[PDB]
Amino acid sequence: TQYWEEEIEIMSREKLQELQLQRLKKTINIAANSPYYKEVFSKNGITGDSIQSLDDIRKIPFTTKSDMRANYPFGLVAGDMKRDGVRIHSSGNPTVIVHSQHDLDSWANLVARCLYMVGIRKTDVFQNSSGYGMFTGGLGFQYGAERLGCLTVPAAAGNSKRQIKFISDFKTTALHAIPSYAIRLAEVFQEEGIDPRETTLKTLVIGAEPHTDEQRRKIERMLNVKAYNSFGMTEMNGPGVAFECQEQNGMHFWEDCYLVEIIDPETGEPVPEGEIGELVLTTLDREMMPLIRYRTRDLTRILPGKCPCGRTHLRIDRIKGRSDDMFIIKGVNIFPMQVEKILVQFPELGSNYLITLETVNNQDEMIVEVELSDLSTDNYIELEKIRRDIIRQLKDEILVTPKVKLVKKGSLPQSEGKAVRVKDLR
Amino acid sequence: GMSTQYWEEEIEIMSREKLQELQLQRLKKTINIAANSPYYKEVFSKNGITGDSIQSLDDIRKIPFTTKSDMRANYPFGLVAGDMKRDGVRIHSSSGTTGNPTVIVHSQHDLDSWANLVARCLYMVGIRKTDVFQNSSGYGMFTGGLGFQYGAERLGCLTVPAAAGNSKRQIKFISDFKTTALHAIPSYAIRLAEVFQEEGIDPRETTLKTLVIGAEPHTDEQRRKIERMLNVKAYNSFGMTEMNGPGVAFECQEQNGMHFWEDCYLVEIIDPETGEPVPEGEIGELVLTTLDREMMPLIRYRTRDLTRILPGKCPCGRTHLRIDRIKGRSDDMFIIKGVNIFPMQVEKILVQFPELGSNYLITLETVNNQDEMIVEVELSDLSTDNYIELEKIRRDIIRQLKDEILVTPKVKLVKKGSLPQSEGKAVRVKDLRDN
Ligand SMILES: Nc1ncnc2c1ncn2[C@@H]1O[C@H](COP(=O)(O)O)[C@@H](O)[C@H]1O
Ligand SMILES: Nc1ncnc2c1ncn2[C@@H]1O[C@H](COP(=O)(O)O)[C@@H](O)[C@H]1O
Ligand code: NA
Ligand code: NA
Ligand SMILES: [Zn+2]
Ligand SMILES: [Zn+2]
């Protein structure tokens, strides 16, 4: 195994904790200068002596998206923005993250660290099909990949024909795409008469949206690549927060730059070790605008045990779904991943699907539209048998009986960005 | 002069004598680097260019011109002189899939040199690290995006990477982030002042102080109109992807000619017909040579831009030559919404549809201060009048053009023989804008 920063990546749990505590104290002292935490810390009796251990963080209230919207745009800016601010990023009212040069360098180093871990080197041709501008994925991977030294191709979002031309003519080896756009690319290669398994592509970086392991394995087969799960959010910089190692089993969270908590969304207490809860994060290397115990609304768990790659930084499971992604139908709580985890195991089905929620008279109804695979199987009796097995397997998982419609390949809508899997018309 | 502040004083006010010895030292190094590229290795052997060929700056005229046609013929890496696998860190590409685009490969040195020139430009017109700099240019493969982004960060501005379009969000950023310096194409700068009034905001009473305008030819009266509408100082910015993008030439606070950074570029003005140097101060074609690029240097590149060198010393005290505003081109290229387009790009899309004829006309107009591109194309009679099917094809034309020329044009399907004709040498472009 090769590391970008070996001394940090394989640091003992004991030394890593002392580093987190040193940086947690510094973060709280910096945050105290912002109008928001000056008031929060004052009202909750948070002083320079309040944090003596990492468990003392639980003395501080959570920071919510609502708290951030209420303090838009610069209520949480702790540093001297006029003197040291170098960038404003965005994601009703948008969320603003203000960065200093230190913050951008720390972020670029984390992205380089992530890319290096999955085997990308300066000899790689890295193409970024993420949107640029206010999108953190754009400039975040651009700076990270340049810090590593890749020959970068700043393709940006859309124009699939141009994307394929760049891969073919510039001999791209590493590609950053949202999982649903990675599938569209394989299809565009075939449309342009190129075998998607015989290109120069070797590594794919996929994140931005929840997706199953089988969806990633489908992408790996279509393009004959190794695809890696990438976790990020604007509040936490963007990309580079958590990332799979070459074991493809859990995403390593960089604990030298983040303090990770998994809380019970109801009680607000830490969940038992290894249980699903809401991911709550604290920045440990941000200076202009630190975030303390930020409630991400993302649900996941901490995967136990040390990893065979030798890294000592904890691993998180793939995101189950966001809290706002959940929908209630006939009194039952359902997540769109529960539907995807069932649909992906059928090889007769495609990758695009849509959940539609409607009211028929006074009763709510759930419709699951899923595209059929290009791989023949055009037999009504056999397809209808599979469709019945889909309703059956859904009913057992989501504990409600949905309507399932098998639709033509490419008939469902395709977004320019993250896929919208639920359309609620109630 | 006395009150003037410089980013790099030793370079910006360097004596003409010292500046010419610096140019000669870098010109020799550039030719030795370029000799490693497949393209210049072949040009230098065919024209007897050796390590002893350049002894003075006038000896550059021993080397033939590099044209866009030569670059397209050597697509994608025929002019790469450095070790791209070991040191290449970025590729910038021009638009299209119909023909061979233009590719510029940069090393870390090249990106640092580029960002220092943009920082130098921004500092000259009074922008400081305390400024809130908003970039309304397109990012991705657009050099205006990453070029101003890196330059403004190098200077230290609080940057707002707004990128292209969404005027209501542009005005929101200016209002909420208290933007003081804005980069926009001149026609978009006018649109933003109109959108401010539509949203009930006085465009003269915002936090804006400095505007950086470029990418498209515009008159001085157009710039002064922008200054009045937004109560700002607006400065002309010259650049092109081949020379990096932004940071090539830029107005000083005198707003009288654009200073060309001669420590990084060797500037020649030639007769577009003969290829000979024009008499000092006359209009000719701008021919440029990179002096600080290492991965892919460009020698005597024919820009096709027509301008002149403005004589006399500048009161700002800078010794780097000034060029007049670009009033035209010696080729068929046109610029709309800050995007460079060739009429052949359009033609290579239109010929793919059998439902269309051979006659077409591109018209450039200004409708309610906004620039618009109209593509009129005659209908082939090897197609019937199925409105629903024709309109479907017309939408596919707009879609395929947008993907190629990177701008959304208006497409009008006209009757066979309805378009005018006067020759085979007929100008497929009719520009009716006040420029
Ligand atoms: N690897 C990933 N898997 C699942 N969801 C993700 C992943 N990366 C990002 N997200 C989601 O995207 C959100 C961040 O969105 P944004 O700030 O717009 O980039 C996160 O809070 C997650 O809900
Ligand atoms: N300040 C300017 N005034 C007029 N035309 C400009 C200006 N800056 C750039 N251009 C035009 O834009 C071309 C370069 O486009 P690009 O390579 O996309 O940056 C030049 O060769 C000019 O024709
Ligand atoms: Na490289
Ligand atoms: Na600043
Ligand atoms: Zn691991
Ligand atoms: Zn001057």
Question: Which of B97, B122, B180 is most worth mutating to test chain A (most A CB atoms within 10 A of its CB)?
Answer: B97
Q: Please indicate whether residue B241, judged by its CB atom, sits closer than 6 Å to ligand 2.
A: yes
Q: Return d(Cα B244, Cα B132) in angstroms, integer.
A: 24
Instruction: Dig out the tokens for A54 from the structure.
Output: 């990492």
Ligand number with the minimum distance to the CA of A123:
3
- Flag whether residue B89 sits within 8 Å of chain A, measured between CB atoms: yes
Containing A355, the helix (H) or strand (E) segment is strand A349-360
Containing A420, the helix (H) or strand (E) segment is none
Q: How far is CA B198 from the centre of its chain?
A: 31
> Counting Cβ atoms within 10 Å, is residue A58 exposed (0-12), middle (13-18) or buried (19+)?
middle
Whether A368 and A346 have beta carbons less than 8 Å apart is answered as no
Containing B336, the helix (H) or strand (E) segment is strand B334-336
DSSP structure class, residue B66: B
- Flag whether residue A156 sits within 8 Å of chain B, measured between CB atoms: yes
Min Cα distance B422 → chain A (Å) is 37
Q: Return d(Cα B291, Cα B288) in angstroms, integer.
A: 10
> What radius of gyration, in Å, describes the C-alpha atoms of chain A?
23
Q: Do A133 and B105 touch (CB under 8 A)?
A: no
Report residues whose beta carbon is within 6 angstroms of any ligand 1 atom. Answer: A 91, 136, 207-210, 229-234, 238, 296, 298, 319, 322
Which of A192, A150, A3, A185 shows the shortest CA–CA distance to B84?
A150
Strand partners, B92: B104
Containing A329, the helix (H) or strand (E) segment is strand A327-329
Ligand 2 center to residue B338 CA distance, Å? 8
Beta strands in A179-293 (DSSP E): 203-207, 226-233, 238-244, 251-253, 258-263, 277-283
Q: Is the dihedral of CA A141, A144, A150, A153 positive or negative?
A: positive
Containing A6, the helix (H) or strand (E) segment is helix A6-9
- Flag whether residue B217 sits within 8 Å of chain A, measured between CB atoms: no
Look-up: residue for tokens 């449309």?
Answer: A191
Whether A223 and A204 have beta carbons less than 8 Å apart is answered as yes
Q: Return d(Cα B247, Cα B113) in angstroms, integer.
A: 10
Q: Do A132 and B89 touch (CB under 8 A)?
A: no
CA angle A273, A279, A284 (to 5 degrees): 100
Phi, psi values for residue A85, rounded to 5°: -70, 130
Whether B97 and A167 have beta carbons less than 8 Å apart is answered as no
Ligand 1: atom nearest CA of A322 is 23
Whether B388 and B381 have beta carbons less than 8 Å apart is answered as no
Phi-psi group of B73: left, alpha or beta (phi > 0 → left; psi -120 to 50 → alpha; rest → beta): alpha
Alpha helices in B277-407, H assignment, sequence order: 343-350, 387-405
CA angle A279, A285, A290 (to 5 degrees): 65
- Flag whether residue A166 sits within 8 Å of chain B, measured between CB atoms: yes
Instruction: Dig out the tokens for B263 from the structure.
Output: 């420590």
3-state secondary structure of B250: strand
Question: Which of B93, B296, B399 is most worth mutating to test chain A (most A CB atoms within 10 A of its CB)?
Answer: B93
Q: Please indicate whether residue B214, judged by its CB atom, sits closer than 6 Å to ligand 2.
A: yes
Length of chain A: 426
Q: Please indicate whether residue B345, judged by its CB atom, sits closer than 6 Å to ligand 2.
A: no
Phi-psi group of A240: left, alpha or beta (phi > 0 → left; psi -120 to 50 → alpha; rest → beta): left
Which of A237, A280, A292 shows the shortest CA–CA distance to A34?
A292
Q: Do B90 and A152 touch (CB under 8 A)?
A: yes
Length of chain B: 435
Q: Return d(Cα A264, Cα A275) in angstroms, integer.
A: 9
Domains, in order of start, for chain A: 1-325 (3.40.50.12780), 327-426 (3.30.300.30)
Min Cα distance B93 → chain A (Å) is 9
Discontinuities in chain A (C→N > 2.5 Å), after residue:
91
Min Cα distance B412 → chain A (Å) is 24
Q: Return d(Cα B97, Cα B345) in angstroms, integer.
A: 9
Q: Do A151 and B403 touch (CB under 8 A)?
A: no
Phi, psi values for residue A386, rounded to 5°: -65, -45
Ligand number with the minimum distance to the CA of B186:
2
Q: How far is CA B388 from CA A159, B378, B414, in A?
A: 26, 18, 16
Look-up: residue for tokens 């290449």?
Answer: B88
For residue B95, say whether it is annotated as part of any ligand binding site: yes
Q: Return d(Cα A280, Cα A388) in angstroms, integer.
A: 40
Residue B144 identity (one-letter amino acid):
G
Taking the CA atoms of residue A77, residue A80, residue A86 and residue A90 in that order, the dihedral angle to the nearest 10 degrees is 10
3-state secondary structure of B364: strand
Instruction: Dig out the tokens for A13 from the structure.
Output: 């749990």
Strand pairing report for A226-233 and A238-244: antiparallel
- Flag whether residue A174 sits within 8 Å of chain B, measured between CB atoms: no
For residue B234, say whether it is annotated as part of any ligand binding site: no
Q: Do B158 and A132 touch (CB under 8 A)?
A: no
Look-up: residue for tokens 């290894």?
Answer: A274
